[PDB]
Design an enzyme around this catalytic site. Structure first.
Site, short mmCIF file in Angstrom:
data_model
loop_
_atom_site.label_atom_id
_atom_site.label_comp_id
_atom_site.label_asym_id
_atom_site.label_seq_id
_atom_site.Cartn_x
_atom_site.Cartn_y
_atom_site.Cartn_z
N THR A 297 0.88 -1.21 0.00
CA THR A 297 0.00 0.00 0.00
C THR A 297 0.90 1.23 0.00
OG1 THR A 297 -2.01 -0.92 0.94
CG2 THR A 297 -1.59 1.38 1.45
B1 BO2 Z 1 -2.09 -2.14 1.70
O1 BO2 Z 1 -1.32 -3.14 1.00
O2 BO2 Z 1 -1.57 -1.98 3.03
C1 BO2 Z 1 -3.57 -2.58 1.76
C2 BO2 Z 1 -4.41 -1.43 2.29
C3 BO2 Z 1 -5.87 -1.92 2.47
C4 BO2 Z 1 -6.65 -0.89 3.31
C5 BO2 Z 1 -6.58 -2.14 1.12
N1 BO2 Z 1 -3.72 -3.76 2.62
C6 BO2 Z 1 -3.88 -4.98 2.10
O3 BO2 Z 1 -3.92 -5.22 0.89
C7 BO2 Z 1 -4.06 -6.11 3.12
C8 BO2 Z 1 -2.83 -6.98 3.28
C9 BO2 Z 1 -1.76 -6.19 3.74
C10 BO2 Z 1 -0.68 -5.91 2.89
C11 BO2 Z 1 0.39 -5.14 3.34
C12 BO2 Z 1 0.40 -4.65 4.65
C13 BO2 Z 1 -0.67 -4.93 5.50
C14 BO2 Z 1 -1.74 -5.70 5.05
N2 BO2 Z 1 -5.07 -7.00 2.55
C15 BO2 Z 1 -6.22 -7.28 3.18
O4 BO2 Z 1 -6.54 -6.81 4.27
C16 BO2 Z 1 -7.05 -8.16 2.52
C17 BO2 Z 1 -6.55 -9.05 1.57
N3 BO2 Z 1 -7.41 -9.93 0.91
C18 BO2 Z 1 -8.76 -9.92 1.22
C19 BO2 Z 1 -9.23 -9.02 2.18
N4 BO2 Z 1 -8.36 -8.15 2.81
#
Ligand code: BO2
Ligand code: BO2
Ligand code: BO2
Ligand code: BO2
Ligand code: CL
Ligand code: CL
Ligand code: MG
Ligand code: MG
Ligand code: MG
Ligand code: MG
Ligand code: MG
EC number: 3.4.25.1
Lengths: 195, 196, 233, 204, 222, 212, 226, 195, 196
Positions: I1
């Site tokens: 992210t």
């Molecule tokens: B980003 O990569 O931090 C993103 C922000 C979110 C608010 C859309 N998080 C995610 O994609 C998270 C995983 C993650 C990655 C990197 C750091 C922390 C967390 N994904 C999920 O929460 C997720 C994944 N698949 C289904 C549902 N939720």
């Protein structure tokens, strides 16, 4: 504790229970009676974790004695066994479960039939002609499978029980210091003082 | 640790911070991470100080023996010797090394060797814990065939930011210039590079 | 039970003849990342007390709010709130100490090390420590984290025992504190050059200095250091 | 589980005026079970005395090993080994098992036959030499022995006075340790006479 | 994972005389290999001619002393300013400690004073509340160094009378306050030499029918 | 710890050692492991010092309340069961107790109950409890009779603790003797093992293994 | 443990405290942490005591044989190289943390060595549990162009900081000065700021106080003639 | 295996060893002889891990018998015990150590004295008047401390040994199926067939 | 992210990538991480999608109820509500949130709330896994009182680099402009921002 046996014959139920109590490395006692009279024609033997066994047996005893006074009537062995099973089935999903296995031997005065029930700490009930808890059954069931006949007399039942205890004394590693034998029939409960 | 090597018109320049840490304690604030395996083949060291010193010592030995038999080795040859040690002993080593050197035929060259023991020839390379914070900056600001003065500024500005954000990086910014002219050592103190 | 996330490093302090000095750098670290460069970790309470906090910053901000709320509460139905019934350093400390020990006893600690520096009503110097475990102690010099290992030795050369306090001036004491902050910048990998310093004097009151920098650093000798042993060039 | 406290036991050594003293308890056990009350822990090779605490199998093994080595030394050198030299031999022998060590706490005591100078020394399980002027302690009640020696000891004690000091140091330390006691022995050592005394102590 | 316990070092010592009692303790406070304070009082006057010290984890030690001082205050309120006897204080402390049987105060507690016959008294506690009246007790880090010395020099253990050779014991003659303070000072000097957590200073509280007196002595600061 | 108690013609003999340890460190040699619950009841202490002390002096409070309410001495059976039911409530929490509740009443006669932190409650004639219980059992079982004199029974109990004090590393210090009769218990002194061992060795001709 | 090394005008000085500890107990109060590798190459050791002694003896022995083989006085870089390669081979398991100093025909030198085999160069260095207390003093008072007298003062002050503030260090200060063109002077117990005070009482017992069971003469002499 | 005892009297050494062999839940045998004759006047009993015990005992036996043939001479009990200790001391730092505890009872024909040695699997040797391995000593040492006398006859030694076995049969949890007793004296080794 | 918020002359702009990942699988390549808690108070979300959505929903509820009683809330007030939820439930949450809003009195403001639950008021803020790679770039290129066009370029260039290096970041670059004029949504596709 260790070994508890049960056998249902023609006109009675015979329960045999070891006398030894061992804590760790020492046999603290060699004359312990691992049983409680629930009602005049119903006897329960028990074996499991220290403390839990007696606490559970006396708790059941108190409840059945309370029922007897309230109704001026003795519950059937089947009814008592069901009450006990439910308590253990309730117990197994508690914070700290009762770690106790029991045999319930009773004479039903209505049907004029002896009855033997085997219940484990999970609340697993089965009616049987002969039963055992722990490692006892591993030795004794083969003998009983051969010798048991369901029309046996009480004297024949005691002889078959002696053959079971002899086999246990020969092949089991633990010295269980012999057994206390008790008979349950139409006349009530009595102890065989010489065995 | 913040280390980098950059090729430019006249050759190649190596750059590094001077911090060595045991956890959060700075065990040495004036460390020299730019080390010499041959006259005009140097390397930047990151990871275990013991491992990278042991490796660098062995490489210097190998190239000294190479020179006695076959004459001056290429920078590619030096990188291969580093790789052979890092790859074959990957299970027991924690070493991230950048190899940089100057030939007259090949001019300035840079080879980076990360943890696995793989080799990557690049126009410039960055490594160490502090490098993470300057991928954006370095990618945007790097040009090929820069001048000596421009390359010094690029490394000075880059490592300044790496030091600013990474706790494991700090102290002075050491640099080593490799050209046909020879070998020049540069040093830049906190008062200079912090105000950038 | 938690783990600290955004963290603050050493808080250092000492007593002198007419009061107490306390200092702490303006960094909020996120592991090895030096994330936040403008964090004030000395929080004054009235004109007679400064609370220096290290450790978890989210918990620091919570404690900051408790102290702010403590001042408000003390003023309620208190005509002598700015005089005889004003908040003392000893009162502020004991409150925090109570909270810290209560929180460790619920297995949910405030992940901090705290030094309360101030001057009492009768002019007496106050300097006492408390941390996430509720452990408390007082000493002529007090320091948290890396300061305990590096600052205390330097500050104890100025004031080694109680009898050395009247013999120590504010100029000598501040000099020792500023030097200690420089040493911590040399040697603490989670410290910054920018810091804040506070003096609480029984005569001149509370002096709060912001945006101080470590200066007069020795680095020139670095140029002579080459290789790690045998290397000459 | 911890090899250094399965069998139990203690050794203590002290210097006096033109004399040294070394003493030990007699217990050998298997954790809580007391097995033997005759397990002496002090041995001697010529005029050099060695006390060994710790795992009993290693105590026996090392005694046999140093008897072996001091006997070859004497045949080749044509003289008895001295305390200073023997101390180095113990250190060498222990360190060669650096990464598979004997779980022991040796203590050397004796008087140099040429200079007449009293000498004591202690070791850890892997060879490190502690050459103290005053006293050396070893075993499961080493903390207790440190406390007794540090308070009771004074320099330049006469042989018969030194006996009382070291005996009281051992006895009272042993009585505060579950794995030490069951008897005690004290050696008083002068340049050309050595007296051995068994102490009467509580047998629990 | 969070560890709610810590070790602040230190060492304490109680000795009961014929008509007096002493409770001593070093003034050093530590964590790991660092000194927190060279003078942090550890033995406290709790009122009613009772002195107390809770050695080990200082946060629990301070908490306990604070709660006992409180208990003395409420004992006066609830029972018409009656003096809390040393035996009653001891039993009260047992309940304070056992009240946290399953999350203990990580301390070795000692109290000292005079019994109701005016004779010297020392009581000793473990962390979970077991207690026992004693003539002599050392507690804390260097307790293992000091107790054997006190078995020998206070109770004359393993000592016999010359000429008789083990037949007749050394008689258990009483010790004066000057004689006890000598033994306390030597105990701590010896402990300081061989235990890294002991040093800086020694603070002794003496209890007599006249009240509570204090004495302070310097110890080695290394 | 070694504690024992046994029924005989002249009532009950109770004998205990005095040692307390923390690991290999001997914490105390003067511990009172017998508790005077009332002039007719005794309790022994083995395992955790605090657990035993706290809950047995608590037991005395419950026994006192019983006889205030019921105008009658509490039975040994009832007193033992109050303690066993209490520790059973705490089962799993980590209490560490091995105790004998010893007494005499008109209706029961001399009675001994073994009560334990796992919830075990056993009536019996002979019991030995603690780390040195096996050593005490050896002497007791080979020399026990119902027809023992108060003098001979007392010595047997004293001797059985001595046996365990010698061999068991976590037992020792001194021996406390009690004799429980029709008219209550009677204390029979503190016997230091350091003096008792040599006395018994000389007079009895035992411990020929040890040198004296 | 507190050990330091300080460069100066015409040489180098090293110093150390004298405390050894097993856990919280002091094993030796007057321990010798300054080891001689060769006449004019000395090193101070921290960590596991048997290891620092053993690894110093081994390298010191091989350095002596090397000096005899080459007909040259030994160099500090030789001792440094042989120590680091030995320690690296044992992957840190030989717990020796050394400050290596000396003078040789090349000049005066100061290095540190860690157990895993990493070396560092410096004008001032400190190792051990009290290195933070010592380094604080060094960072506050060190300057370029120190004299011999100033360097000894700075080195001993750095050890004192360890002695007083670190519980792992204590007792006395040992020093060794190695000046160019001179014999190395080993100053054992250069400072003694921790003498124990006189005890209040004498604990000398009356003769016969201890109970004895048996007495016997021990035969230490050889088998006799005639 | 389980229980092995030893007692040295005036003119002999008596070794008692249990007959039971248990693998898990069953007693496979009740007549097992846990001993090997090393030489005409030296007997070794043993107990430890399955397989290791016999393999070690027979290995020692073979080595001593080899010595006897080579030198046409019987080694002293002291010499045999030292050889055994060294093998176990060597063993404890091996890839897979011998998990065996032994008692060595012998009569020294030179000194005309009985000798009893106790050695554990670590190689811990002690000479004793009476000894035991495992949990046996926890019961038997108190009796022997009382009753033992250095000048007992062989008959008195057997009576004291019966008192030890009776106590073990009373207080030990495991049924060890009695003991085989063997006497070692000037005339050699013999087995007491009725015990 | 990769998320960021930047104050400028006319107000504040929020920026974010559009990638949501379950390990290495991109569960959603067109995610909207810029979410609305009030008319001119928005936030950027990083960490757990479930946690940050649950938090944002609760905050929007709190501010809606605040508005009904006390009128439009300040950006500081919104940040405090976020903090209260993140701090008090720190043990059970994984949420890294940037709060940005526009008042007429206070103009553009940015508050960042990392894992612990601490609050930090800043001129600009960066967060998310990809932010690590642009600390150097953003620190060197940020100026106060930039224009709208300059701020859009700054965010576009910054997130472009973050996306380039971070595997967890990608897709389109979404932006939300907060000024007195109103609320403007911007989108920038790969073909545009990759060639920068
Ligand atoms: B980003 O990569 O931090 C993103 C922000 C979110 C608010 C859309 N998080 C995610 O994609 C998270 C995983 C993650 C990655 C990197 C750091 C922390 C967390 N994904 C999920 O929460 C997720 C994944 N698949 C289904 C549902 N939720
Ligand atoms: B740098 O931080 O990676 C640095 C480069 C090294 C060649 C001087 N490494 C170290 O400082 C390492 C620790 C480390 C930090 C970050 C990533 C990987 C490793 N330090 C040491 O190896 C070290 C520390 N103290 C004493 C000796 N060696
Ligand atoms: B006894 O050994 O069981 C004894 C009896 C107790 C009532 C004093 N217990 C202890 O000594 C225990 C340790 C222990 C040793 C062996 C078996 C079981 C328990 N000690 C303590 O409870 C204790 C109390 N205070 C200080 C130190 N130790
Ligand atoms: B110093 O504190 O680092 C010191 C330097 C040493 C070379 C004299 N170290 C020690 O004293 C070590 C500390 C240590 C303790 C435990 C494991 C490893 C290291 N002590 C010893 O080496 C030691 C301990 N007891 C006896 C002998 N040696
Ligand atoms: Cl390096
Ligand atoms: Cl989302
Ligand atoms: Mg079933
Ligand atoms: Mg109850
Ligand atoms: Mg004992
Ligand atoms: Mg110190
Ligand atoms: Mg991407």
């Amino acid at each position: 504790m260790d070994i508890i046996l049960g056998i249902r014959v023609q006109d009675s139920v015979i329960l045999a229970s070891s006398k030894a109590v061992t804590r760790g490395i020492s046999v603290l006692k060699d004359s312990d009676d691992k049983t409680r009279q629930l009602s005049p024609h119903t006897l329960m033997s028990f074996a499991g974790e220290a403390g839990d066994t007696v606490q559970f047996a006396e708790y059941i005893q108190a409840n059945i004695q309370l029922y007897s006074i309230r109704e001026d009537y003795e519950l059937s062995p089947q009814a008592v066994s069901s009450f006990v099973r439910q308590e253990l089935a309730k117990s197994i999903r508690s914070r700290r479960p009762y770690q106790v296995n029991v045999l319930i031997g009773g004479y039903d005065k209505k049907k004029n039939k002896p009855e033997l029930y085997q219940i484990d700490y999970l609340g697993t009930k089965v009616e049987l002609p002969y039963g055992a808890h722990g490692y006892s059954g591993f030795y004794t069931f083969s003998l009983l499978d051969h010798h048991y006949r369901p029309d046996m007399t009480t004297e024949e039942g005691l002889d078959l029980l002696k053959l079971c205890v002899q086999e246990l004394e020969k092949r089991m590693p633990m010295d269980f210091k012999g057994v206390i034998v008790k008979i349950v029939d139409k006349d009530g409960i009595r102890q065989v003082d010489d065995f | 640790t913040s280390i980098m090597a950059v090729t430019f018109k006249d050759g190649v320049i190596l750059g590094a911070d001077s911090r060595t840490t045991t956890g959060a304690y700075i065990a040495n604030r004036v460390t020299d991470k730019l080390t010499r395996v041959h006259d005009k083949i140097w390397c930047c060291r990151s990871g275990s100080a013991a491992d990278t010193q042991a490796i660098a010592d062995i490489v210097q030995y190998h190239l000294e023996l190479y020179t006695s038999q076959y004459g001056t080795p290429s920078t590619e040859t030096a990188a291969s010797v580093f790789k052979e040690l890092c790859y074959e002993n990957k299970d027991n080593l924690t070493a991230g090394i950048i190899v940089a050197g100057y030939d007259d035929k090949n001019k300035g060259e840079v080879y980076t060797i990360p943890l696995g023991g793989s080799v990557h020839k690049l126009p410039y390379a960055i490594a160490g814990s502090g490098s993470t914070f300057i991928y954006g900056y370095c990618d945007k600001n790097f040009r090929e065939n820069m001048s000596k003065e421009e390359t010094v500024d690029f490394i000075k500005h880059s490592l300044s930011q790496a030091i600013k954000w990474d706790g494991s990086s700090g102290g002075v910014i050491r640099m080593v210039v490799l050209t046909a002219a020879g070998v020049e050592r540069l040093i830049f103190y906190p008062d200079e590079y912090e105000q950038l | 039970t938690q783990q600290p996330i955004v963290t603050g490093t050493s808080v250092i302090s000492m007593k002198y003849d007419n009061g107490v000095i306390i200092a702490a750098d303006n960094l909020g670290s996120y592991g090895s990342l030096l994330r936040f460069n403008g964090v004030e970790r000395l929080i004054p309470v009235g004109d007679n007390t400064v609370v220096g906090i290290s450790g978890d910053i989210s918990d620091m901000q919570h404690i900051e709010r408790l102290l702010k709320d403590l001042v408000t509460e003390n003023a309620y139905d208190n005509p002598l709130a700015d005089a005889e019934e004003a908040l003392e350093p000893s009162y502020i400390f004991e409150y925090l100490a109570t909270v810290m020990y209560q929180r460790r006893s619920k297995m949910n600690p405030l992940w901090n090390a705290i030094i309360v520096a101030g001057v009492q009503s009768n002019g007496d110097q106050f300097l006492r420590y408390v941390n996430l475990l509720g452990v408390t102690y007082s000493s002529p010099t007090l320091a948290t984290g890396f300061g305990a290992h590096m600052a205390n030795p330097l500050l104890r050369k100025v004031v080694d025992r109680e009898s050395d306090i009247p013999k120590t001036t504010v100029q000598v004491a501040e000099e020792a504190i500023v030097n200690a902050m420089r040493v911590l910048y040399y040697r603490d990998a989670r410290s910054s050059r920018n810091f804040s310093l506070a003096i609480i004097d029984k005569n001149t009151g509370l002096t709060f200095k912001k945006n101080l920098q470590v200066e007069n650093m020795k680095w020139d000798f670095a140029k002579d250091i080459k290789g790690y042993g045998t290397q000459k060039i | 589980s911890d090899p250094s406290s399965i069998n139990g036991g203690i050794v203590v050594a002290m210097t006096g005026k033109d004399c040294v003293a070394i003493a030990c308890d007699l217990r050998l056990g298997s954790q809580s079970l007391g097995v033997s009350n005759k397990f002496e822990k002090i041995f001697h090779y010529g005029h050099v005395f060695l006390g060994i605490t710790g795992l009993a199998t290693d105590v026996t093994t090392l005694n046999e090993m140093f008897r072996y080595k001091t006997n070859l030394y004497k045949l080749k050198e044509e003289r008895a080994i001295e305390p200073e030299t023997f101390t180095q031999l113990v250190s060498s022998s222990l360190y060669e098992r650096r990464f598979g060590p004997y779980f022991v706490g040796p203590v050397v005591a004796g008087i140099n036959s040429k200079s007449g100078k009293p000498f004591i020394a202690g070791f850890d399980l892997i060879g490190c030499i502690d050459e103290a002027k005053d006293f050396i302690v070893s075993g499961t009640a080493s903390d207790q022995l440190f406390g007794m020696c540090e308070s009771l000891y004074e320099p330049n004690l006469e042989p018969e006075d030194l006996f009382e000091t070291i005996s009281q140091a051992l006895l009272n330390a042993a009585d505060r340790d579950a794995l030490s006691g069951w008897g005690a022995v004290v050696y008083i050592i002068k340049k050309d006479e050595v007296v051995k005394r068994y102490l009467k102590m509580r047998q629990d | 994972q969070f560890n709610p316990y810590g070790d602040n070092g230190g060492t304490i010592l109680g000795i009961a005389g014929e008509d007096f009692a002493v409770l001593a303790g070093d003034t050093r406070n530590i964590t790991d290999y660092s000194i927190n304070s060279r003078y942090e009082p550890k033995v406290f006057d709790c009122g009613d001619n009772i002195v107390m010290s809770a050695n080990g984890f200082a946060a629990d030690g301070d908490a306990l002393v604070k709660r006992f001082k409180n208990s003395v205050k409420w004992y006066h309120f609830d029972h018409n300013d009656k003096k809390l006897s040393i035996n009653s204080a001891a039993r009260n402390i047992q309940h304070l400690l056992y009240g946290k049987r399953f999350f203990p105060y990580y301390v070795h507690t000692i109290i000292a004073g005079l019994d109701e016959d005016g004779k010297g008294a020392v009581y000793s506690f473990d962390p979970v509340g077991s207690y026992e009246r004693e003539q002599c007790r050392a507690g804390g880090a260097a307790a293992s160094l000091i107790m054997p010395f006190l078995d020998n020099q206070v109770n004359f253990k393993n000592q016999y009378e010359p000429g008789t050779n083990g037949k007749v014991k050394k008689p258990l003659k009483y010790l004066s306050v000057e004689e006890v303070i000598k033994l306390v000072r030597d105990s701590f000097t010896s402990a300081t030499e061989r235990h890294i957590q002991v040093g800086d200073g020694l603070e002794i509280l003496i209890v007599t029918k006249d009240g509570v007196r204090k004495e302070f002595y310097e110890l080695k600061r290394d | 710890t070694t504690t024992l108690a046994f029924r005989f013609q002249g009532g009950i003999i109770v004998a205990v050692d005095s040692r307390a340890t923390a690991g290999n460190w001997v914490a105390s040699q003067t511990v009172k492991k017998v508790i005077e619950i009332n002039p007719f009841l005794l309790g022994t202490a083995a395992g955790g010092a605090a657990d035993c002390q706290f809950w047995e002096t608590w037991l005395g409070s419950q026994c006192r309340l019983h006889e205030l309410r019921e105008k009658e001495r509490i039975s040994v059976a009832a007193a033992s069961k109050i303690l066993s039911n209490l520790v059973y409530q705490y089962k799993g929490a980590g209490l560490s107790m091995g105790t004998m509740i010893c007494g005499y009443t008109r209706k029961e006669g001399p009675t001994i109950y073994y009560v334990d932190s796992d919830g075990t409650r056993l009536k019996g004639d002979i019991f030995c409890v603690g780390s040195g219980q096996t050593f005490a059992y050896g002497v007791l079982d080979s020399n026990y009779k119902w027809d023992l004199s108060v003098e001979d029974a007392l010595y047997l109990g004293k001797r059985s603790i001595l046996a365990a004090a010698h061999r068991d590393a976590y037992s020792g210090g001194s021996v406390n003797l009690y004799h429980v009769t029709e008219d209550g218990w009677i204390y029979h002194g503190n016997h230091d093992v350091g003096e008792l061992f040599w006395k018994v060795k000389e007079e009895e001709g035992s411990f020929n293994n040890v040198i004296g | 443990t507190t050990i330091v090394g300080v460069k100066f005008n015409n040489g180098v000085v090293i110093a150390a405290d004298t405390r050894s500890t097993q856990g919280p107990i002091v094993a030796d109060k007057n321990c010798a942490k300054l080891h001689r590798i060769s006449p004019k190459i000395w090193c101070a050791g921290a960590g596991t005591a048997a290891d620092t002694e053993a690894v110093t003896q081994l390298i010191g022995s091989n350095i002596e044989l090397h000096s005899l083989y080459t007909s040259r006085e030994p160099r500090v870089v030789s001792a440094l190289q042989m120590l680091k390669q030995h320690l690296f081979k044992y992957q840190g398991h030989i717990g020796a943390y050394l400050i290596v100093a000396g003078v040789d025909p090349t000049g005066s030198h100061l290095f540190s060595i860690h157990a895993h085999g990493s070396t560092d160069v410096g004008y001032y260095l400190s190792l051990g549990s009290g290195s933070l207390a010592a380094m604080a003093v060094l960072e506050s008072h060190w300057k370029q162009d120190l004299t011999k007298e100033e360097a000894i003062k700075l080195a001993s002050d750095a050890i004192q900081a360890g002695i007083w503030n670190d519980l792992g260090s204590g007792s006395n200060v040992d020093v060794c000065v190695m000046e160019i063109g001179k014999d190395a002077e080993y100053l054992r117990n250069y400072l003694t700021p921790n003498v124990r005070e006189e005890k209040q009482k004498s604990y000398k017992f009356p003769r016969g106080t201890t109970a004895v069971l048996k007495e016997s003469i021990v035969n230490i002499c050889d088998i006799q003639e005639e």
